[PDB]
Amino acid sequence: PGTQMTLKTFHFAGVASMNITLGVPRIKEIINASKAISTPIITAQLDKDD
Amino acid sequence: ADFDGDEMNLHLPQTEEAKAEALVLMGTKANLVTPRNGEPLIAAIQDFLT
Amino acid sequence: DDPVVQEIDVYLAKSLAEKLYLFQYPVRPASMTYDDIPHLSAKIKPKQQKVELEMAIDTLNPNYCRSKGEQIALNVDGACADETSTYSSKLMDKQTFCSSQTTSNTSRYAAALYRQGELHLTPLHGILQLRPSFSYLDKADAKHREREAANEAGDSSQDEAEDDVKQITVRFSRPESEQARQRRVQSYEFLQKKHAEEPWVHLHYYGLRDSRSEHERQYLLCPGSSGVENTELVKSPSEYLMMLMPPSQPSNVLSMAQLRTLPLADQIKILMKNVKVMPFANLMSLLGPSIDSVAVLRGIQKVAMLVQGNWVVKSDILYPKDSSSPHSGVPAEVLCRGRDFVMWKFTQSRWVVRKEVATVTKLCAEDVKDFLEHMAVVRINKGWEFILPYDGEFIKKHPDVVQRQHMLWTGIQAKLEKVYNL
Amino acid sequence: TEFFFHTMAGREGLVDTAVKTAETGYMQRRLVKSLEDLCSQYDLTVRSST
Amino acid sequence: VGASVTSSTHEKKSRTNMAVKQGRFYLRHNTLSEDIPIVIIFKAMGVESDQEIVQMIGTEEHVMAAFGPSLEECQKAQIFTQMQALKYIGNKVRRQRM
Amino acid sequence: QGDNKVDDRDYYGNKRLELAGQLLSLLFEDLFKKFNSEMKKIADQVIPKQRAAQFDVVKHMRQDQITNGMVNAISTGNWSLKRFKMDRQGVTQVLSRLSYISALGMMTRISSQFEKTRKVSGPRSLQPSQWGMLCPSDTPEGEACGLV
RNA sequence: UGCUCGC
DNA sequence: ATTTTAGTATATGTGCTGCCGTTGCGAGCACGGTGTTTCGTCCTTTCCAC
DNA sequence: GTGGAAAGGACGAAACACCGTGCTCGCAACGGCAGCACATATACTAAAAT
Ligand SMILES: Nc1nc2c(ncn2[C@@H]2O[C@H](COP(=O)(O)OP(=O)(O)OP(=O)(O)O)[C@@H](O)[C@H]2O)c(=O)[nH]1
Ligand SMILES: Nc1ncnc2c1ncn2[C@@H]1O[C@H](COP(=O)(O)OP(=O)(O)OP(=O)(O)O)C[C@H]1O
Ligand SMILES: [Mg+2]
């Protein structure tokens, strides 16, 4: 799938911002298990989400 | 492959055990599906679907 | 947009041509001036202009730190030496401004004094930029070095008489290589020493508030009448443009301007070689109306022939004696004979058959095609037609030339009937 | 202008694929060199070479 | 965001760079042991007044605000004349192997 | 340092094209300087100690130096100029005689300074500056895509 | 060793 | 004798100059191979005299 | 047409080290995980004043 992956763009995951590394660079950063990665994302849930 | 000048290799085993292992494990009829997700790769193609 | 108002006259003055200098302070705004600052002296050199102003600054003003003044004065000079002191008192009292030369030549710069209805211009002998020089710190560092040497010598209270007799260390005046000699000449120390070789000249300062300023200010003007026709400054715009912009020093290689720079005969020859088909009026328009028609006619009669009122370049002009056919390699004489036969067929009839010419001249298809394309176009169901229409005006205007070309074509026809057995 | 923009897009795709080939080749080499030791034993437990 | 200039004549080609690694501009060249502040080089090249240097850099408020740290670092040292700056530069000069 | 108006290297307005003329000029200058240095060395070695028979350069002007230098630099294609410290390779290439179009297109080729060994993907893009100057579509498909 | 190619 | 300051002592924590990688397989071709700088032995060829 | 002696040109050959002289450049191709130097911060401990 790495060869099958096209390394596309514009995939902001619905927020139209916050450029995140996805694709072969993302898989490489995951498999390398580096302590510091590029563009770290943390999803936090709220007690009062409304 | 796309039949636009691709060169492919063809090897001949020199052992009965190797020949049997190739025919059994790497048989075309026994590898109709990829181990990635089980989807069949050997199927109809252009001029066969149409 | 006419010059409605302000027709100001411009006068020139040579009284202060060699005595006018421009001093600009890049670090001092125009608001604050040095009119109230009492100056003390000005060092200057006639050659290699570099003026150093030495002025005095007040001390009792609240904008001066007397403690730091005493400190810097003790640093730059000695305790009570006063033999060569940058300051007379124990405080920083004198300030040095050093000049840097902007450009070597200042002939294109001029000072303009404006009076009611007139503007007087005066050339500038030199322009220098005055900046506050930091030279007392260098002497302070030198004095600190000599004080360090004194402290080194004073390590012991009583110093024995040193037997440091100067052994004769006279070095060889080695013959210096030309590269090393050029390096020494181009060195900064050599240039600075050469500049220092010129003796200094001391000058007093006269401020703007002094009466001498207003006295000598009148020298920028010149005695002369209001309206005087200048003897010089009378060159035409073309001459001025030539002055301020001095010069550095296929067969269609030569351009139109390079053509017009050539004699008329060469112009006609090159034009007939390039176009090979053109009327007389077009040639007169291209060469120019300033050229007489008789000269152009005599020139074209030597390199062209008359076909149906038009002019076609001669065969030998296109094909020199040493040339050959680029397609078949046949000698140029056969090409000239074939082209003469084609032109004769065109003079006899406006329509020419390619197959007949190929059969008579015994030439290949490509040579006949090249001969026809130079003077004909393909008309369907009619063969080859002459590219230009019948020009009867030139024929009516010059009957003698028509008769000359007719007898020349008669001779050419006789030669062609003798050769090709027509 | 449209042809020039289309050629720009095509060259961008070409260079993207050119980089992707080598990047995924190196990634595949690393992944296979790391994962080639594992094997499924007869006791239904996946064990390494050691 | 730094700058680089590859000055190439018929004889020598030298690429000199300028960096802002610590809010101040340092000039880096292959002939210098350590990059030196740009204000020291300004003082070494004839112009010694800091006001003239600031005027040459620019008169915009943000320009002065950005160039302030360089002036402060220059004033931290005792480099105020051309001779001192030239000596400081020469201290950062290494001989081309004897 | 404020608005990110960073200049781009791929802008061809800042690019320069060296033909065979400038390269041959630099090579001939280097070879002539080497020949002059060799002649000066031969003079320094021969004149002061040989004999009353006066030394002349004509007996030592080797004619194979410049010829061999030019031949090797043109054939092998590697240019090593110590006076300029330029070490280039692949300057000359064998003319392809596959067809007339092949040679005609190879005659107007242009190589990049990047000298492809890695995936730069920064000059390989088709910049709008190539309008009217370079062909946008003509490029070798493969590892040399965008740099030739 | 270099380089042009073939996917 | 006890609380405050000086030192030292190691550990830790942020750099900055090192070493290591950079798809695959295929097919052609051109060039150059370590040499060269000066010393000497050998062989040959041709300045005048016969 | 000939010859005894002379020079010089070419091909082995040995001392030294790929560059005539001793100089001399640019550029990093881009990350990225080890690090080792420094540096230096802080606290622990013990000597000194009250
Ligand atoms: N310049 C150059 N170097 C070459 C050439 N062939 C080989 N090399 C060098 O030799 C190395 C590879 O050697 P091979 O090609 O295996 O030599 P080979 O083909 O075994 O040699 P043979 O046994 O004579 O066929 C490379 O690192 C090159 O630097 C050539 O034709 N030119
Ligand atoms: N560098 C390479 N590495 C691996 N495989 C390659 C390489 N170059 C070519 N190939 C082979 O050629 C194939 C590439 O073809 P592909 O890119 O899918 O079509 P294409 O060349 O874009 O054709 P179109 O331009 O779409 O008509 C796939 C691969 O097996
Ligand atoms: Mg294919």
Side-chain angles (χ1 to χ4, degrees), chain A, chain B, chain C, chain D, chain E, chain F residues 1-140 142-148:
Chain A
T3 41
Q4 302 301 326
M5 275 189 291
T6 73
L7 193 56
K8 56 177 297 182
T9 50
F10 205 73
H11 45 263
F12 301 99
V15 305
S17 60
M18 299 187 63
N19 172 266
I20 53 180
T21 61
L22 292 182
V24 178
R26 182 54 188 176
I27 298 300
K28 180 179 181 300
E29 292 181 358
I30 290 175
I31 64 179
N32 288 19
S34 60
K35 303 178 181 60
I37 68 173
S38 59
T39 67
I41 301 302
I42 297 180
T43 300
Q45 301 295 335
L46 302 182
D47 303 330
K48 307 176 183 178
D49 53 354
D50 53 354
Chain B
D2 39 354
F3 294 144
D4 57 352
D6 293 9
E7 310 175 13
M8 298 190 66
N9 308 336
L10 177 140
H11 309 80
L12 180 60
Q14 308 297 281
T15 305
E16 303 289 342
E17 297 175 337
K19 169 183 178 181
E21 287 192 356
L23 186 57
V24 172
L25 302 180
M26 303 191 316
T28 307
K29 302 178 299 180
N31 298 327
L32 296 177
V33 294
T34 174
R36 177 179 59 180
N37 49 16
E39 297 176 350
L41 294 185
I42 297 92
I45 202 60
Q46 51 179 117
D47 284 76
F48 298 154
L49 299 172
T50 300
Chain C
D1 45 358
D2 52 350
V4 279
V5 295
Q6 310 300 139
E7 195 172 18
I8 308 178
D9 298 329
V10 178
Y11 301 151
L12 197 151
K14 295 294 297 300
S15 60
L16 299 180
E18 303 178 3
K19 304 177 181 61
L20 188 59
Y21 285 157
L22 182 59
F23 293 158
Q24 48 183 351
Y25 306 91
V27 304
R28 170 62 70 92
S31 57
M32 293 73 66
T33 60
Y34 294 89
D35 302 330
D36 300 331
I37 299 299
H39 296 52
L40 300 180
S41 180
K43 306 177 63 179
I44 201 181
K45 297 179 177 178
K47 300 175 297 301
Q48 304 172 358
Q49 46 183 359
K50 184 174 63 63
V51 58
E52 181 178 358
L53 302 178
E54 193 82 21
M55 310 182 307
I57 56 180
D58 52 354
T59 304
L60 46 83
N61 57 328
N63 289 78
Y64 188 88
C65 181
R66 321 191 84 264
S67 60
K68 190 176 183 60
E70 291 286 343
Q71 181 182 7
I72 188 60
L74 184 60
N75 291 330
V76 60
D77 300 329
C80 300
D82 297 329
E83 63 267 355
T84 54
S85 180
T86 57
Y87 308 107
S88 59
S89 60
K90 293 296 299 179
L91 293 162
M92 181 170 181
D93 210 330
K94 298 196 303 179
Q95 188 175 10
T96 75
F97 284 177
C98 180
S99 58
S100 181
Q101 187 173 3
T102 64
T103 178
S104 60
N105 55 329
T106 59
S107 60
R108 63 182 302 178
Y109 305 97
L113 191 145
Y114 178 81
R115 291 173 60 93
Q116 46 277 357
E118 53 265 1
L119 185 63
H120 299 247
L121 306 184
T122 306
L124 269 61
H125 188 261
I127 302 179
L128 307 176
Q129 289 180 352
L130 291 168
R131 294 184 178 91
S133 180
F134 299 90
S135 60
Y136 56 92
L137 289 184
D138 300 330
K139 296 184 178 181
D141 297 0
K143 205 127 188 179
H144 179 269
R145 179 178 294 102
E146 80 179 4
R147 289 167 187 175
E148 288 287 343
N151 296 329
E152 292 176 0
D155 51 355
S156 61
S157 181
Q158 179 181 359
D159 300 328
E160 301 180 0
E162 297 181 0
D163 298 329
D164 194 6
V165 288
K166 291 212 302 293
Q167 186 184 0
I168 326 178
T169 60
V170 269
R171 292 185 173 184
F172 280 177
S173 62
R174 301 181 181 180
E176 193 179 16
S177 59
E178 194 167 5
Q179 298 181 357
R181 185 175 182 179
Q182 290 175 1
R183 291 179 181 180
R184 178 193 297 183
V185 170
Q186 296 178 359
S187 60
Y188 171 79
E189 185 176 3
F190 183 82
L191 269 64
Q192 188 177 194
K193 186 176 182 179
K194 183 179 180 180
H195 286 301
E197 284 178 0
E198 183 170 349
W200 288 99
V201 179
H202 296 63
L203 312 178
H204 311 77
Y205 182 84
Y206 302 96
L208 181 61
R209 314 300 174 88
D210 189 11
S211 60
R212 189 185 307 270
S213 61
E214 192 70 19
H215 164 264
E216 199 170 342
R217 189 174 178 177
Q218 70 180 4
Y219 283 164
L220 293 185
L221 311 183
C222 61
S225 180
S226 300
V228 172
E229 179 67 24
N230 197 333
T231 60
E232 298 294 337
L233 301 178
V234 296
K235 288 197 173 186
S236 63
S238 181
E239 293 177 355
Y240 191 23
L241 183 58
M242 294 300 104
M243 175 184 299
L244 55 87
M245 287 302 299
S248 60
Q249 178 66 24
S251 59
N252 300 271
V253 46
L254 298 182
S255 62
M256 183 59 60
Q258 298 179 350
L259 185 67
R260 296 179 180 180
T261 54
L262 294 180
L264 181 63
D266 298 331
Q267 298 179 10
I268 298 180
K269 178 182 179 180
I270 295 175
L271 284 177
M272 293 306 299
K273 184 179 181 181
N274 296 335
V275 195
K276 307 170 188 178
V277 164
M278 58 188 306
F280 188 78
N282 297 21
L283 182 59
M284 293 298 300
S285 61
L286 290 180
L287 294 178
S290 61
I291 308 179
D292 190 63
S293 60
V294 182
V296 178
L297 181 59
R298 294 177 302 180
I300 196 180
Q301 279 179 136
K302 302 180 301 179
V303 297
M305 307 293 295
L306 185 67
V307 178
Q308 301 181 6
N310 302 275
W311 289 99
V312 181
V313 67
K314 295 183 178 180
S315 305
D316 63 329
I317 300 301
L318 299 181
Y319 308 97
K321 59 179 60 60
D322 62 329
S323 64
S324 61
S325 182
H327 306 272
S328 60
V330 301
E333 183 178 2
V334 181
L335 303 176
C336 292
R337 294 175 181 178
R339 195 174 187 272
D340 293 1
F341 177 80
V342 170
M343 293 185 301
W344 173 80
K345 274 295 183 179
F346 271 100
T347 55
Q348 293 292 340
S349 180
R350 189 178 179 88
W351 315 95
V352 179
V353 182
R354 178 182 179 181
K355 184 178 181 180
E356 297 180 359
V357 176
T359 303
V360 171
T361 59
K362 302 298 182 179
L363 295 181
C364 51
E366 45 272 4
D367 287 339
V368 180
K369 182 175 179 295
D370 293 3
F371 292 156
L372 292 179
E373 284 184 347
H374 293 171
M375 64 188 65
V377 292
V378 183
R379 290 292 181 266
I380 306 181
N381 300 330
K382 295 178 179 181
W384 291 78
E385 186 182 3
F386 199 87
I387 176 179
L388 290 187
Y390 184 83
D391 188 8
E393 298 182 359
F394 181 80
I395 296 181
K396 295 179 182 179
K397 289 177 181 179
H398 308 80
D400 54 330
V401 183
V402 171
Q403 186 69 19
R404 285 193 55 184
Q405 297 294 335
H406 178 269
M407 65 197 302
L408 289 180
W409 281 122
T410 302
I412 294 180
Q413 171 182 358
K415 292 187 176 181
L416 291 168
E417 291 178 0
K418 180 180 180 180
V419 171
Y420 295 98
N421 302 330
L422 297 179
Chain D
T1 61
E2 295 165 354
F3 180 82
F4 199 94
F5 299 149
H6 195 46
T7 315
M8 290 177 58
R11 186 165 294 184
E12 291 287 348
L14 260 57
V15 60
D16 174 72
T17 55
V19 178
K20 180 65 61 59
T21 48
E23 191 175 359
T24 311
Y26 182 55
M27 182 179 61
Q28 167 88 9
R29 180 185 181 272
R30 293 187 303 178
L31 292 180
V32 177
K33 185 61 63 179
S34 181
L35 300 179
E36 62 178 2
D37 295 72
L38 261 50
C39 179
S40 181
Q41 302 292 338
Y42 277 92
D43 54 356
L44 301 180
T45 66
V46 180
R47 309 195 182 192
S48 59
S49 59
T50 60
Chain E
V1 181
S4 300
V5 37
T6 307
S7 181
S8 86
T9 182
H10 189 15
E11 294 78 10
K12 298 181 179 180
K13 309 178 183 179
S14 60
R15 180 193 66 177
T16 157
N17 307 333
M18 186 166 57
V20 68
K21 59 182 65 177
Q22 285 289 344
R24 64 192 71 91
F25 307 97
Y26 289 158
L27 191 144
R28 185 185 301 102
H29 194 271
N30 299 330
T31 58
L32 299 180
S33 300
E34 184 183 0
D35 52 336
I36 52 186
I38 188 60
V39 193
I40 300 182
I41 301 186
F42 269 107
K43 289 184 174 299
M45 291 184 303
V47 42
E48 294 169 330
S49 178
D50 301 330
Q51 176 194 4
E52 182 69 16
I53 303 175
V54 175
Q55 291 178 357
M56 291 168 52
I57 299 307
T59 61
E60 291 77 11
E61 179 65 26
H62 52 265
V63 171
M64 273 94 66
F67 204 77
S70 60
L71 300 174
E72 170 62 26
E73 205 282 335
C74 180
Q75 293 180 184
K76 286 174 59 180
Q78 308 300 328
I79 302 300
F80 299 101
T81 61
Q82 183 177 359
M83 300 299 299
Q84 296 167 341
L86 286 174
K87 178 181 298 299
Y88 184 84
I89 293 183
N91 294 330
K92 301 299 179 302
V93 172
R94 65 275 179 97
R95 297 231 303 176
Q96 302 82 330
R97 298 189 175 276
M98 301 297 297
Chain F
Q1 201 175 0
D3 54 328
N4 299 90
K5 192 58 183 60
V6 178
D7 192 7
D8 49 351
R9 293 289 184 87
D10 57 356
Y11 182 69
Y12 278 8
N14 304 328
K15 288 296 186 60
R16 295 301 178 270
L17 296 183
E18 296 181 350
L19 297 172
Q22 296 80 14
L23 303 179
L24 286 180
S25 66
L26 297 179
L27 179 62
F28 186 83
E29 180 181 2
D30 189 12
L31 291 180
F32 200 87
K33 289 181 176 299
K34 291 181 178 300
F35 180 81
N36 295 19
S37 180
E38 181 71 18
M39 192 59 54
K40 182 253 299 180
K41 180 260 301 181
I42 292 300
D44 281 319
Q45 290 185 354
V46 170
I47 194 55
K49 302 177 302 177
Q50 171 60 220
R51 198 182 168 267
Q54 312 299 330
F55 153 77
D56 43 351
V57 294
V58 186
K59 308 304 177 300
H60 301 74
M61 287 237 298
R62 184 181 297 101
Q63 301 179 0
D64 298 329
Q65 176 70 17
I66 314 298
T67 300
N68 292 331
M70 292 293 180
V71 167
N72 295 18
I74 292 187
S75 187
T76 61
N78 58 331
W79 296 40
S80 60
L81 306 181
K82 189 180 182 301
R83 306 304 179 90
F84 301 93
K85 292 296 183 300
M86 300 171 59
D87 187 8
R88 295 184 176 182
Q89 294 182 358
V91 181
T92 68
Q93 291 187 357
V94 186
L95 180 56
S96 60
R97 283 298 181 179
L98 302 179
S99 180
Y100 171 79
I101 295 299
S102 180
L104 188 54
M106 192 178 184
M107 184 57 188
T108 61
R109 283 186 176 183
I110 293 182
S111 60
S112 301
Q113 188 186 3
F114 289 83
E115 216 68 273
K116 160 252 310 173
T117 316
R118 85 271 182 181
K119 273 64 185 175
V120 207
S121 178
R124 297 173 171 266
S125 181
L126 181 58
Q127 304 82 9
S129 301
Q130 311 193 14
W131 179 271
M133 312 303 180
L134 273 61
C135 186
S137 300
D138 193 0
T139 170
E143 57 179 4
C145 180
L147 297 190
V148 180

